[PDB]
Amino acid sequence: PPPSSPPLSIMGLMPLTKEVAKGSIGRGVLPAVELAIEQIRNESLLRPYFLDLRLYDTECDNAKGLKAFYDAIKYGPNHLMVFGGVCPSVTSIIAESLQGWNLVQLSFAATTPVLADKKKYPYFFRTVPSDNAVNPAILKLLKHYQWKRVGTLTQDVQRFSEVRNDLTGVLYGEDIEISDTESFSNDPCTSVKKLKGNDVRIILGQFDQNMAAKVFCCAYEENMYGSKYQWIIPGWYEPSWWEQVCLRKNLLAAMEGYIGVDFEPLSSKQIKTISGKTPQQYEREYNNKRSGVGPSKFHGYAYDGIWVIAKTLQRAMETLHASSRHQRIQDFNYTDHTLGRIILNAMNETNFFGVTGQVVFRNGERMGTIKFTQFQDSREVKVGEYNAVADTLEIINDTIRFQGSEPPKD
């Protein structure tokens, strides 16, 4: 469509191959990416330039990821910034080498708590809230229900370890005490026995879905369920995770009432976003584009990530026209330190309303919203939301319920 216009090239890094489990995120977010790019092209928002997104398959592999990045630099056009990075290890290797290349990176799916280190990854940004974002939200929930004595059950895996350790920092001046800290790698039954021995009533769990069935099976035999107990665990599990299989009836008896915590895929506010669409109008539109592609909960973040990139380039263009004798953006060979500086500062100024809510960074980290769910009878039900920017907890009244006439005591 754009004949005389120079391209603003972006290096899209993600697993796209069907030969890799995580390639579904890449493929699932592609319709959202195309929707933001079609509108940017139709209305020519980068006039007289155009958005040139180039895609490179990381294949969710460390070696392959690094080769795709280097091949993109060597034989590809002049990329102004990096868009993507899904698998934690692949994103960490690439992000480590950005400053040397004058390349600002924006990820929509890499949730690892590790990438928060702006001493190691100074040129890395992300629209998606990190795994640690659940902690301030959890802290707000505990104070709301006067649960000042908790116990923690963590899986001995980096993903979960990093979240549990960040929790120690979050609870500093807070009137909350972790009367018990338990760990496990293969079997949680021993740690659950210990929590019951220590008389723990409110449990903060950090483990995968396979381990969750084991935890709830142990909880049943140890009587750690019902009216006197409250489990707070990851909300990102698969709809029928428990159906994938103690007996299944006992597993459900121990599951009943548990609270799920995860990031909110899309905002519930009916406000017009930066695109000029509401999060609900974008969702229906996204659903027509996918055409059975399968849904990714990171689609909203990817859509917003493209809008962050376009607004960053719009700001970068304004700055360059203000600085005489050097405004040839299309010419950026990775040498320009000043160009990277301008892009970096322009992304740090991001503050707009996206499909995933208010898009704001705090040292390259997203200030987003956290979703609270509860397992009632046969499915998880949305029981509230946490706003990171405002530090606001809003519990949907007449949804969250307890086994007794009132919430359990700590």
Ligand X SMILES: *[C@@H]1O[C@H](CO)[C@@H](O)[C@H](O)[C@H]1NC(C)=O
Ligand Y SMILES: *[C@@H]1O[C@H](CO[C@@H]2O[C@@H](C)[C@@H](O)[C@@H](O)[C@@H]2O)[C@@H](O[C@@H]2O[C@H](CO)[C@@H](O)[C@H](O)[C@H]2NC(C)=O)[C@H](O)[C@H]1NC(C)=O
| Residues near ligand X (CB under 6 A) | 35, 38-39, 42, 333, 335, 396-397
Question: Using CB under 6 A, which of 24, 39, 179, 348 touches ligand Y?
Answer: 348
Of residues 176-205, which lie at the interface with ligand Y (CB under 6 A)?
Answer: none
Q: C-beta of 320: minimal distance to ligand X in Å?
A: 16
Q: C-beta of 361: minimal distance to ligand Y in Å?
A: 8
Cβ proximity to ligand X: between 389 and 396 the closer is 396
Amino acid at 407: P
Q: C-beta of 217: minimal distance to ligand X in Å?
A: 35
Per the CB < 8 A criterion, the answer to whether 138 and 178 are in contact is no
What are residue 248's phi and psi, to 5 degrees? Answer: -65, -25
Token look-up 């705090």 returns: 362
Partner touching 335 among ligand Y, ligand X, none, CB below 5 to 8 Å by kind: ligand X
Q: C-beta of 362: minimal distance to ligand Y in Å?
A: 6
Cβ proximity to ligand X: between 241 and 353 the closer is 353
Q: C-beta of 12: minimal distance to ligand X in Å?
A: 19
Question: Using CB under 6 A, which of 43, 187, 349, 391 touches ligand Y?
Answer: 349
Residue sitting closest to ligand X (CB): 333
Token look-up 């309303």 returns: 353
Quote helix, strand, coil % in the chain, to nearest 5. 40, 20, 40
Cβ proximity to ligand X: between 38 and 177 the closer is 38
Cβ proximity to ligand X: between 251 and 393 the closer is 393
CA distance 188 to 176: 24
Partner touching 240 among ligand X, ligand Y, none, CB below 5 to 8 Å by kind: none
Judged by DSSP in three states, 13 sits in: strand
Cβ proximity to ligand Y: between 58 and 358 the closer is 358
Angstrom CA distances, 157 to 106, 207, 346, stand at 26, 8, 36
Strand partners, 372: 261, 384
CA distance 76 to 37: 20
Partner touching 360 among ligand X, ligand Y, none, CB below 5 to 8 Å by kind: ligand Y
Q: Which stretch binds ligand Y (CB under 6 A): 267-275, 346-354, 373-381, 397-405?
A: 346-354
> By CB under 6 A, is residue 360 in contact with ligand Y?
yes
Partner touching 177 among ligand Y, ligand X, none, CB below 5 to 8 Å by kind: none
Cβ proximity to ligand Y: between 327 and 351 the closer is 351
How do strand 259-263 and strand 369-376 relate by DSSP bridges?
A: antiparallel
Of residues 289-328, which lie at the interface with ligand Y (CB under 6 A)?
Answer: none
Of residues 326-345, which lie at the interface with ligand Y (CB under 6 A)?
Answer: 345
SS (H, E, C) 322-367: HCCCCCCHHHCCCCCHHHHHHHHHHHHCCEEEECCEEEEEECCEEC
DSSP 115: G
CA dihedral 259, 262, 268, 274 (to 10 degrees): 170
CA distance 195 to 72: 52
Cβ proximity to ligand Y: between 345 and 399 the closer is 345
DSSP 409: P
Binding site for ligand Y (CB under 6 A): 345, 348-349, 351, 360
